[PDB]
Amino acid sequence: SVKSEYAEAAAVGQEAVAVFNTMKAAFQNGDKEAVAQYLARLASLYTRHEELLNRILEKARREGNKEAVTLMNEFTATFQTGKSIFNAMVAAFKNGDDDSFESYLQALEKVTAKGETLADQIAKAL
Numbered sequence: 001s002v003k004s005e006y007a008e009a010a011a012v013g014q015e016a017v018a019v020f021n022t023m024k025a026a027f028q029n030g031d032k033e034a035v036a037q038y039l040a041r042l043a044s045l046y047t048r049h050e051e052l053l054n055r056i057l058e059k060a061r062r063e064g065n066k067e068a069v070t071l072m073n074e075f076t077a078t079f080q081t082g083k084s085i086f087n088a089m090v091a092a093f094k095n096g097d098d099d100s101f102e103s104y105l106q107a108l109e110k111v112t113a114k115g116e117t118l119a120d121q122i123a124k125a126l
């Protein structure tokens, strides 16, 4: 059901947290080859996460589940902010701008946390 889809979306989000934290450690340690691979894997994880979120939102709309639709619209808007920040982080890595990369790492953590505040209301709405 939409809940098994929620559970997979939540798990993909958690996988991205895990890989992000490994990548932050690799960035701090100066292991650029690792950072490159973790960024590629994060890109794939965020693409999958977005796919699942869109299926959940479309299913909620087709059900006419107004509260789930509202929460999912809010969550996905914050998710898109995070993706913009992620993209900027990737560009800072490409450009060799470690100062900006550090800053974006911090911003992405805060934007991710902002969206997660909605997750527990989403689960009970769907």
Ligand SMILES: Cc1ccc2c(C(=O)O)c[nH]c2c1
Pocket (backbone or CB within 6 Å): 008, 012, 015, 041, 044, 045, 048
């Ligand atoms: C790179 C990648 C892509 C998709 C998934 C996934 C999923 O589709 O549920 C779980 N971990 C992943 C990791």
